[PDB]
Design a protein around this motif. Structure first.
Motif, PDB file in Angstrom:
ATOM      1  N   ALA B 218      -3.340  32.300 -14.325  1.00 10.00           N
ATOM      2  CA  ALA B 218      -3.453  33.072 -13.074  1.00 10.00           C
ATOM      3  C   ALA B 218      -3.109  32.427 -11.784  1.00 10.00           C
ATOM      4  O   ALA B 218      -2.633  33.003 -10.934  1.00 10.00           O
ATOM      5  N   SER B 219      -3.195  30.932 -11.867  1.00 13.61           N
ATOM      6  CA  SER B 219      -2.541  30.243 -10.734  1.00 13.61           C
ATOM      7  C   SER B 219      -0.927  30.341 -10.779  1.00 13.61           C
ATOM      8  O   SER B 219      -0.351  30.552  -9.778  1.00 13.61           O
ATOM      9  N   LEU B 253     -16.599  26.240  -0.687  1.00 10.31           N
ATOM     10  CA  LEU B 253     -16.078  25.175  -1.578  1.00 10.31           C
ATOM     11  C   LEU B 253     -14.999  25.560  -2.712  1.00 10.31           C
ATOM     12  O   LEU B 253     -14.950  26.688  -2.353  1.00 10.31           O
ATOM     13  N   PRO B 254     -14.374  24.614  -3.129  1.00 13.06           N
ATOM     14  CA  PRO B 254     -13.171  25.107  -3.766  1.00 13.06           C
ATOM     15  C   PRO B 254     -12.971  26.381  -4.393  1.00 13.06           C
ATOM     16  O   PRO B 254     -12.030  27.225  -4.301  1.00 13.06           O
ATOM     17  N   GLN B 255     -13.889  26.315  -5.506  1.00 16.54           N
ATOM     18  CA  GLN B 255     -13.648  27.675  -6.281  1.00 16.54           C
ATOM     19  C   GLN B 255     -13.971  28.807  -5.610  1.00 16.54           C
ATOM     20  O   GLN B 255     -13.362  29.947  -5.764  1.00 16.54           O
ATOM     21  N   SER B 260     -11.533  33.775  -4.067  1.00 15.11           N
ATOM     22  CA  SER B 260     -11.265  34.829  -3.113  1.00 15.11           C
ATOM     23  C   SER B 260      -9.968  35.078  -2.889  1.00 15.11           C
ATOM     24  O   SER B 260      -9.529  36.409  -2.752  1.00 15.11           O
ATOM     25  N   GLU B 261      -9.116  34.112  -2.675  1.00 12.57           N
ATOM     26  CA  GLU B 261      -7.809  34.155  -2.708  1.00 12.57           C
ATOM     27  C   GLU B 261      -7.044  34.995  -3.841  1.00 12.57           C
ATOM     28  O   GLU B 261      -6.364  35.950  -3.530  1.00 12.57           O
ATOM     29  N   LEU B 262      -7.447  34.659  -4.932  1.00 14.44           N
ATOM     30  CA  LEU B 262      -7.018  35.354  -6.308  1.00 14.44           C
ATOM     31  C   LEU B 262      -7.259  36.960  -6.043  1.00 14.44           C
ATOM     32  O   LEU B 262      -6.731  37.779  -6.401  1.00 14.44           O
ATOM     33  N   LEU B 263      -8.777  37.156  -5.809  1.00 15.33           N
ATOM     34  CA  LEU B 263      -9.141  38.556  -5.734  1.00 15.33           C
ATOM     35  C   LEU B 263      -8.411  39.404  -4.604  1.00 15.33           C
ATOM     36  O   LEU B 263      -8.320  40.558  -4.571  1.00 15.33           O
ATOM     37  N   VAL B 269     -10.134  36.027 -12.580  1.00 15.07           N
ATOM     38  CA  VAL B 269     -10.510  35.100 -13.735  1.00 15.07           C
ATOM     39  C   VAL B 269     -12.012  35.100 -13.990  1.00 15.07           C
ATOM     40  O   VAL B 269     -12.905  35.238 -13.165  1.00 15.07           O
ATOM     41  N   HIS B 270     -12.148  35.134 -15.398  1.00 16.16           N
ATOM     42  CA  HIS B 270     -13.540  35.189 -15.652  1.00 16.16           C
ATOM     43  C   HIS B 270     -13.947  34.467 -16.943  1.00 16.16           C
ATOM     44  O   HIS B 270     -14.428  34.827 -17.969  1.00 16.16           O
ATOM     45  N   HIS B 271     -13.613  33.126 -16.801  1.00 16.77           N
ATOM     46  CA  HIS B 271     -14.225  32.205 -17.831  1.00 16.77           C
ATOM     47  C   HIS B 271     -15.628  31.789 -17.698  1.00 16.77           C
ATOM     48  O   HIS B 271     -16.148  32.135 -16.578  1.00 16.77           O
ATOM     49  N   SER B 272     -16.050  30.913 -18.552  1.00 17.78           N
ATOM     50  CA  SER B 272     -17.257  30.179 -18.193  1.00 17.78           C
ATOM     51  C   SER B 272     -17.619  29.005 -17.476  1.00 17.78           C
ATOM     52  O   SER B 272     -18.669  28.543 -17.370  1.00 17.78           O
ATOM     53  N   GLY B 273     -16.479  28.636 -16.716  1.00 17.69           N
ATOM     54  CA  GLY B 273     -16.745  27.503 -15.852  1.00 17.69           C
ATOM     55  C   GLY B 273     -16.587  27.884 -14.420  1.00 17.69           C
ATOM     56  O   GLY B 273     -16.107  27.013 -13.701  1.00 17.69           O
TER      57      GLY B 273
END
Lengths: 150, 383, 794, 149, 305
Positions: B218-219, B253-255, B260-263, B269-273
């Motif tokens: 996705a990046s 904070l980074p994520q 938000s940029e991706l959305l 993205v929807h992983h567990s981290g």
RNA sequence: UUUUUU
């Protein structure tokens, strides 16, 4: 604010109260200890064996009058009985995580089969209260030997 | 609710028992929720819980069991699990007799050898109902990269009638032979999005197989922008209103910024981290179709039903426990099944994406079709 | 209503029952339900130690039960519930039980009657007997036996008789035995018989042990029976076996209180180290009497030991478990329950004194005094006298303290010293000196002799005779080790006389070999005052800055620096503002003085800011006023801030604002000053300044009449003081000379003489020079300004 | 008596080793007290595994002690002082969802141990677990789910 | 095991300076939910929480200095405010205009409290008395007298017939409105109180002094039922829940705690403010809390029923 | 090299 000189004069020479001589310490008080374990004895009361239940007209039931009957599922408790007749519970309580409470019957199990047909009202069994008194607690090896009372 | 009694709906997944709660409170009246931490209204008549809480309030009395009529076991095919299959059987044993049982399942073969056990553990007759012919059937394609700039050619290897087509595989193997790490994969995803955006089968859910790959591709995709202006306004307004309750440092904070940029472009993205506040926003912006490409993982594949337009896979083998196993037929069926949407398309397309080596149709046969699983019993002793 | 009652929720059921009763009044089941609901509320009230509410509830329950019994008096359950209500008030400390029973219950239905404890229990027994008469069941038999037991217990516990309650006990045993034989498969009956069998009047332990064992066998899940056996073993010196029974009993029920109390008692007997924590846990579960007394004892004993306050025993337990407040509440409940035991009162007094709740400590000691009037041991009565008198003296009413100290044998150091301090506080300085010397006679622990010498110095100084006080303090200095209190007192005495000779020597002596003093603020104050005596007036601020540099913490030091900068050398106003703000930041409880000083410093500064809101003088003084609205300095600061804001707005020439509040602030200043003990000169200065400022403000706003009436009232109050008359002159001469007019020489000469009346005040002279300019006599104005200049320069 | 004699801000970090379910290791930049509490817990685990394997159970001591995988102990210890989330995220290479997970799984265990210390009879363990729990849940780690509200 | 507590709204800068008092009134019979706040200004801003947010409705002002107490009424649309301005001007809440103005300095009024029927508006004076004015009916009918110190806190029992008054130095006085006779004076703490509250049904009186403790007395006697100590600085306000199970306390350590009186323990703590918290209230059927703080912010929380 | 609950 006041000037330094009079502030110090009041702070130190106003009275001797501030001295460590007059403090809360500097007494070394003592107390004597008196236990009382006889207060620990607890006696619980018996429940009421009556309800004053309503009456019902045999057809299209209507309250003729209120008559008293004998309850039957007393001496039943939430921590010693697994049936849907026991008193509700201690109080509003934690939903789960509660030791010392009994689950209801697991559905494939009923386990109620007994008659015990005496049904007496003068059922005095003539128990002996002074002949041979058992003095061994369940699980222990020895009790205590008390002198007999005449 | 008509009989004034109470009913318990029990779900295994902590994330599945939230939207079910939302939908049951929206559909009618009072629905309490109980989980490890939430305890909204523990006095309602549709309590939703995780089975370990019903197992914990069956061992004590808890005085809720006095008013039940129905216990709705939702996905009773988790009995086959290795560390939680004993919970379903401790619950099915401790249930008192006055409580009727509903067992929703997923069309297992030995359904008459399990309901008979539950029928004769209690003393009630049990009715088994099984159905077929799910709506909006699904066509299993296979996409191999070629002319990655614009051209995308898809080979059909399974159809709405279950007939395996070896001809398509023949074509694929021939093409692969004739042909003769991340930079190729980026062109593969841009060729997929180029052949997918030309049509209206857009809201595509990619299944990646590792969280680093999950947010990495996705990046690396880095230009889609699938959203109009009013969708821009609604996405931004909703997401800022939901995120702006909490304090300042917590919102830079980074994520948070990166996601938000991706959305903003229409990518998720929807992983567990990731923070649960980001998983929840991804699902709620995906449930109204205002996000356009989702790089989800299996957790989205399990906890919900939520039909989407196009499901695209990424590989055949995932490491579970020292195995590097390939998807078993039982697993594959669920993820593939939530491919078609309901009345918004004729069918639904599940795209396999073999890129590294030959597809090996022999094992593709058992993956794409196969009897799902028998129904075992993982009973064991705990302290 | 009945269903809601089943699940607790008694208030809703009561409300529903009352709504039903409002429509129909003879509805028997509603009346019965109301009675049980009140009875259950009463029992819940008695579980926590609220004994008045329980009495209220039981009185009301009897009301409802008699109401029900008028209609249907053949039913048994009503009679039984009445008996339950009557007999559940045991151990409620009589003189708290007066119950308004009325009607049928007392045979004939006459009016109302107020029953005491024994009468109530007798009525309960009568009710149980009558209920049993018409329906003979086992439960009523057991309850009747328990009621007879309670009556016998009550008679014995009041020492009212002995050997005349034998028939009552035999009747109780007869009833319990009848109940047990009626159904010999019930743990309750065996348990009740066992408990009664071991009562002090009967003392048949073998039967009790048998009964408890039968009860345990009848139904194995029984913590009560196991704990009763544990008690039986424990009182008869069987520590091990009693420990076994208690440990197993709590194994069967982890939240039963008595088993935990027994475990604590066993641990105390065998001397373990976690007995105090066990008592704390007992306190945390519920309020029992025995656990309460144990925990209070251990808390007080730990407080006594003064080698603790580094241990992490004292530190963690006492100071992070808030042991002291918990012990106080526990003892309050205990004492209301029992109220005939003196050591409980004495521990309560000690703890209250540590909480600085002095009035309650005095009450506790007072009640202990009343209890101990007659006793075999008189030393504890004397000790109680010293403590009650000491606390009485601590907070006013010195006459009462003196009377208390008279009524004791004055032969030990503590008692004599307390007497001396009380005498000094009332006056009678000669008497206090006599007491202190007499106490000096019998002295060990030379620290005490030095302290008594210092007290002697203080008391004789009060009369005068500074020379002898000085020599006495030097004599104290000759002792083996000084006390840092005689040296400090010597410095203060030296400063009290305007000579710095001995003060410097005393200060050097204090600093040289004393580091165990832990104030670190008082020494700075003494050094600064010493420097101020010599009029240096610049070193002072430098000295305090040095002290703050040494110890950059201690908000107090920063606050003192701000205050001195405000008073001495008010040209570093900016530094003072910074210092006050820093002092305020580093804590919250120094807010008061630090905000006052920083506001005053901002006032001195002027308007040297960026015309920024929220940081002007007005805002900070307002913040201080909100923090502590008790001192008069904040109100005076408010007056000054309002005037300064008026002038700043006038400079910008937009609008005068905040017009009329001077009178209210002046009233506030006077009211606040009235309650200050003594800083007499400072208080006079503050009131005088506030009065002058208020008059000037009234002149400025334009309410001439109000200023006039204020001045007239003030002069009619007291004889003339040459300052206020000047204010009257100023208010007089404002209308005139505002419009051009010629003035007569009589008024001008009068004004000049009036200014001469109150000289040594540059303001007045400058104002007079303005008057000269107004009429126009310039050279005379020049001379007046010159006189003011000379006065200021000198 | 392992836990009883520690600060409440160290017991939370010591108990973070039962829940993390992440690749584990020991530490270097750790106080001495934590570096010995970790050993004490591991020794108690060794005793329990030795009484299991010496009784008839088939689970080797290594298999039982391998469930304890510390490595977020220092991160939890720093979180339970007032440290904002960002510095923790920077601290070590574990995904920022699996940290909120572990903290969520620990603040609910130091509260059932707060409920169990009242049952055993340790009101100092009760008074320390009722502190280590109320100081652990303040911010976005415990943000309310959108669906519920 | 606790319920779901959490923020719903966060006003960023309500006033220009500290906010010193807050009152929540569900005055009209329907769901109005008007929140009135007073600050270190003349501003007495009147907000309305309509559906999900606070929208400013009135910005009325007639004061010269900072407001120390504000109040709202449940029967009439009306409000009252006092300040260091020596004025008790009471507003109308419908057109945003002043109704009256009472002259009273720090020797005649410090803090406001309306009547149970919103008719008398008693205040605490400096010399120890409590002065009972009459709204819409003039001034100063009568004053209860306690021989004490400056008096800070004023509370009315919800059913009437009781009035409580805390003071500097700790002592607490309980009057009965029926006859105006001092029932009894508790000694409570040893330093000023500055906040008191009864419970609905008026059988439980909760104090909050300056040392950090929260005594829980019991009315109709002098029994105290325990001391709640969980703060780390001054306690500045206590508001009692509409159902008799919890109460909320705001302290000067930047923290809003919610206690429950059954077990005398703190269920949930809110760590959301950044400076001293000067005011907390409940709403109607208590399920939300307002907390105004020294930093200019307005928090609204969610305590589900 | 994925996933999960008191």
């Amino acid at each position: 604010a006041p000037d330094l000189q009079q502030e110090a004069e009041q702070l130190f020479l106003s009275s001797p109260a501030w001295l460590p001589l007059h403090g809360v310490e500097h007494s070394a008080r003592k107390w004597q200890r008196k236990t009382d374990p006889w207060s620990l004895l607890a006696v619980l009361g018996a429940p009421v064996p009556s309800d004053l239940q309503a009456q019902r007209h045999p057809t299209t039931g209507q309250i003729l009058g209120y008559k008293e009957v004998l309850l039957e599922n007393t001496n039943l408790s939430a921590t010693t009985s697994l049936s849907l007749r026991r008193p509700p519970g201690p109080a509003s309580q934690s939903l789960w995580g509660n030791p010392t409470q009994y689950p209801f019957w697991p559905g494939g199990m009923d386990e109620p089969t007994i008659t015990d047909l005496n049904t007496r009202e003068e059922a005095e069994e003539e128990i002996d209260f002074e002949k041979d008194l058992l003095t061994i607690p369940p699980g222990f090896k020895k009790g205590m030997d008390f002198a007999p009372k005449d | 609710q008509k009989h004034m009694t109470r009913t318990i709906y029990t779900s295994p997944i902590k994330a599945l028992s939230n939207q079910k709660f939302r939908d049951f409170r929206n559909t009618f009246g009072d629905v309490g929720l109980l989980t490890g931490d939430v305890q909204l209204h523990p006095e309602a008549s549709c309590l939703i819980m995780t089975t370990e809480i019903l197992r914990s309030m069956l061992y004590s009395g808890s005085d809720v069991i006095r008013d039940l009529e129905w216990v709705i076991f939702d996905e009773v095919h988790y009995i086959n699990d290795v560390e939680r299959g004993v919970v379903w059987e401790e619950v099915l044993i401790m249930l008192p007799d006055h409580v009727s049982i509903i067992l929703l399942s997923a069309t297992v073969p030995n359904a008459l050898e399990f309901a008979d056990w539950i029928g004769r553990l209690k003393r009630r007759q049990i009715y088994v109902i099984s159905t077929v012919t799910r709506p909006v059937p699904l066509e299993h394609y296979l996409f191999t990269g070629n002319s990655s700039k614009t051209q995308g050619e898809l080979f059909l290897l399974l159809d709405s009638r279950g007939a395996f087509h070896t001809k398509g595989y023949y074509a694929a193997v021939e093409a692969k032979k004739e042909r003769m790490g991340p930079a190729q994969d980026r062109g593969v995803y841009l060729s997929l999005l180029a052949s997918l955006r030309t049509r209206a089968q857009l809201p595509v859910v990619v299944f990646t197989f590792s969280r680093g790959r999950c947010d990495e591709q996705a990046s690396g995709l880095t230009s889609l922008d699938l959203t109009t202006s009013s969708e821009k306004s609604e996405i931004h307004l909703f997401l800022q209103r939901c995120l702006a309750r909490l304090r300042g440092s917590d919102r830079q904070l980074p994520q948070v910024l990166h996601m938000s940029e991706l959305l903003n472009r229409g990518l998720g993205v929807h992983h567990s981290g990731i923070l649960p506040i980001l998983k929840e926003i991804v699902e709620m912006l995906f449930s109204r179709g205002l996000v356009k490409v989702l790089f989800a993982t299996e957790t989205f594949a399990m906890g919900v039903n939520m039909p989407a337009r196009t499901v695209v896979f990424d590989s055949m083998r995932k490491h579970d426990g020292s195995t590097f196993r390939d998807l078993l037929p039982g697993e594959y069926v669920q993820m593939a099944g939530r491919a078609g949407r309901r009345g918004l398309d004729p069918t639904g397309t599940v795209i396999l994406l073999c890129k590294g080596r030959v597809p090996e149709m022999a094992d593709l046969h058992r993956m794409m079709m196969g009897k799902p699983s028998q129904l075992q019993s993982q009973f064991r002793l705990t302290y | 209503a009945a269903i809601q009652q089943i699940l607790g929720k008694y208030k809703e059921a009561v409300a529903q029952y009352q709504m039903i009763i409002k429509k129909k009044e003879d509805y028997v089941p509603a009346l019965k339900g109301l009675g049980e609901c009140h009875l259950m509320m009463a029992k819940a009230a008695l579980v926590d130690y609220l004994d008045g509410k329980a009495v209220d509830y039981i009185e009301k329950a009897l009301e409802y039960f008699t109401c029900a019994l008028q209609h249907r008096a053949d039913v048994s359950c009503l009679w039984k519930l009445a008996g339950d209500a009557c007999t559940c008030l045991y151990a409620v400390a009589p003189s708290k039980v007066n119950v308004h029973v009325l009607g049928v219950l007392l045979g004939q239905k006459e009016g109302k009657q107020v029953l005491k404890k024994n009468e109530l229990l007798h009525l309960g027994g009568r009710c149980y007997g009558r209920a049993l008469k018409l329906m003979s069941t086992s439960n009523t038999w057991c309850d009747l036996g328990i009621n007879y037991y309670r009556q016998a217990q009550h008679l014995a516990e009041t020492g009212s008789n002995m050997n005349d309650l034998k028939e009552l006990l035999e009747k109780s045993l007869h009833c319990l035995k009848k109940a047990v034989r009626l159904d010999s498969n019930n743990h309750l009956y065996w348990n009740a018989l066992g408990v009664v069998a071991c009562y002090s009047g009967i003392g048949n332990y073998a039967l009790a042990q048998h009964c408890f064992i039968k009860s345990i066998q009848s139904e194995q899940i029984n913590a009560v029976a196991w704990t009763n056996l544990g008690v039986l073993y424990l009182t008869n010196e069987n520590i091990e076996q009693a420990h076994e029974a208690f440990k197993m009993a709590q194994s069967l029920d982890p939240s039963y209180l008595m088993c935990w109390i027994g475990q604590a008692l066993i641990a105390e007997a065998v001397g373990s180290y976690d007995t105090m924590d066990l008592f704390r846990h007992t306190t945390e579960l519920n309020m029992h009497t025995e656990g309460a007394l144990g925990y209070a004892y251990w808390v007080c004993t730990t407080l006594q030991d003064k080698s603790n306050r580094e241990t992490e025993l004292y530190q963690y337990n006492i100071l992070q478990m808030n042991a002291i407040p918990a012990a106080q509440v526990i003892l309050n409940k205990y004492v209301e329950r029992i109220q005939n035991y003196a050591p409980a009162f004495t521990m309560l007094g000690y703890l209250n004194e540590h909480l600085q709740l002095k009035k309650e400590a005095a009450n506790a000691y007072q009640r202990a005094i009343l209890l101990l009037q007659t006793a075999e041991d008189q030393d504890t009565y004397n000790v109680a006298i010293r403590n009650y008198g000491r606390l009485l003296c601590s907070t006013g009413e010195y006459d009462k303290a003196i009377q208390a100290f008279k009524s004791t044998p004055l032969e030990v150091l503590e008692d004599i010293i307390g007497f001396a301090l009380a005498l000094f506080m009332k006056g009678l300085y000669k008497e206090s000196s006599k007491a202190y010397e007499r106490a000096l006679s019998i002295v060990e622990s030379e620290q005490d002799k030095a302290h008594i010498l210092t007290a002697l110095a203080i008391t004789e100084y009060k009369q005068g005779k500074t020379d002898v006080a000085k020599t006495l303090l030097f004599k104290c200095s000759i002792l083996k080790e000084p006390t840092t209190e005689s040296l400090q007192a010597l410095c203060a005495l030296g400063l009290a006389m305007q000579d710095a000779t001995l003060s410097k020597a005393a200060l050097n002596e204090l600093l040289k070999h004393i580091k165990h003093k832990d104030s670190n603020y008082q020494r700075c104050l003494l050094t600064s005052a010493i420097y101020a005596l010599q009029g240096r007036s610049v070193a002072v601020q430098k000295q305090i800055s040095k002290a703050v540099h040494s110890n950059p913490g201690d908000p107090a030091l920063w606050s003192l620096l701000s205050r001195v900068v405000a008073q001495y050398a008010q040209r570093n106003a900016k530094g003072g503002v910074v210092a006050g703000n820093v002092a305020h930041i580093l804590d919250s409880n120094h807010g008061k003085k630090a905000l006052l000083y920083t506001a005053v410093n901002q006032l001195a500064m002027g308007s040297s800011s960026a015309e920024d809101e929220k940081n002007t003088a007005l805002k900070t003084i307002q913040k201080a006023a909100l923090l502590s609205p008790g001192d008069p300095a904040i109100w005076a600061g408010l007056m000054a801030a309002c005037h300064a804001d008026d002038k700043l707005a006038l400079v910008n020439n937009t609008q005068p604002k905040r017009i009329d509040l001077y009178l209210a602030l002046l009233s506030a200043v006077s009211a606040s000053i009235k309650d200050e003990k003594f800083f007499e000169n400072y208080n006079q200065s503050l009131e005088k300044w506030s009065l002058s400022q208020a008059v000037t403000g009234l002149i400025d706003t334009g309410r001439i009449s109000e200023a006039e009436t204020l001045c007239t009232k003030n002069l009619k109050s007291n004889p003339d003081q040459p300052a206020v008359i000047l204010l009257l002159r100023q208010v007089q001469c404002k209308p005139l000379l505002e419009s051009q007019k010629p003035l007569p020489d009589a008024v001008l000469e009068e004004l000049q003489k009036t200014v001469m009346s109150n000289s040594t005040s540059v303001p007045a002279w400058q104002w007079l020079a303005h008057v000269y300019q107004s009429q126009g006599m310039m050279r005379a104005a020049e001379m007046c300004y010159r006189k003011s200049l000379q006065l200021a320069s000198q | 008596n392992a836990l009883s004699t520690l600060r409440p801000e160290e017991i939370a970090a010591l108990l973070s080793g039962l829940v993390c379910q992440s690749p584990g290791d020991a530490g270097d930049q750790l106080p001495n007290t934590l570096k010995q509490g970790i050993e004490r817990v591991r020794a108690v685990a060794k005793r329990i595994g030795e009484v299991q394997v010496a009784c008839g159970l088939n689970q080797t001591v290594e298999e039982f002690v391998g469930e304890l995988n510390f490595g977020l102990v220092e991160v939890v210890y720093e979180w339970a002082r007032g440290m904002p989330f960002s510095e923790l995220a920077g601290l070590s290479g574990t995904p920022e969802g699996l940290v909120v997970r572990c903290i969520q799984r620990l603040a609910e265990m130091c509260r059932s141990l707060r409920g169990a210390a009242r049952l055993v009879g340790e009101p100092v363990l009760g008074a320390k677990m009722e502190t280590a729990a109320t100081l652990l849940r303040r911010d976005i780690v415990f943000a309310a789910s959108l669906y519920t509200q | 095991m606790t319920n779901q507590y959490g923020i719903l709204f966060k006003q960023e800068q309500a006033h220009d300076d500290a906010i010193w008092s807050v009152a929540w009134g569900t005055n009209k019979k329907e769901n109005s939910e008007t929140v009135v706040t007073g600050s270190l200004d003349d501003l007495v801003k009147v907000w309305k929480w309509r559906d999900e947010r606070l929208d400013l409705q009135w910005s009325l002002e007639g004061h010269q200095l900072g407001v120390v107490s504000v109040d709202i009424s449940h029967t009439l649309p009306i409000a009252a405010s006092s300040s260091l301005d020596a004025h008790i001007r009471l507003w109308d809440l419908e057109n945003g205009k002043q109704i009256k103005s009472i002259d009273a300095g720090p020797v005649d009024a410090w803090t406001l409290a309306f009547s149970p029927d919103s008719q008398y508006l008693a205040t605490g004076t400096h010399v120890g008395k409590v002065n009972i004015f009459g709204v819409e009916s003039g001034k100063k009918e009568y004053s209860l007298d306690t021989r004490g110190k400056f008096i800070l806190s004023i509370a009315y029992s919800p059913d009437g017939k009781y009035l409580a008054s805390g003071a500097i130095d700790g002592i607490i006085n309980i009057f009965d409105i029926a006859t105006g006779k001092l029932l009894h004076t508790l000694e409570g703490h040893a330093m000023p109180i500055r906040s008191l509250t009864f419970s609905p049904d008026s059988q439980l009186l909760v104090t909050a002094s300056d040392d950090g403790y929260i005594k829980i007395y019991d009315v109709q006697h002098a029994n105290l039922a325990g001391t709640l100590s969980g703060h780390a600085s001054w306690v500045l306000n206590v508001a009692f829940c509409p159902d008799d199970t919890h109460f909320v306390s705001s302290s000067s350590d930047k923290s809003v705690k919610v206690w429950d009186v059954g077990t005398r323990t703190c269920v949930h703590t809110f760590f959301d403010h950044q400076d001293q918290v000067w005011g907390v209230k409940y709403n109607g059927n208590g399920s939300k809390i307002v907390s105004v703080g020294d930093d200019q912010e307005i928090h609204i929380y969610d305590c589900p029923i």
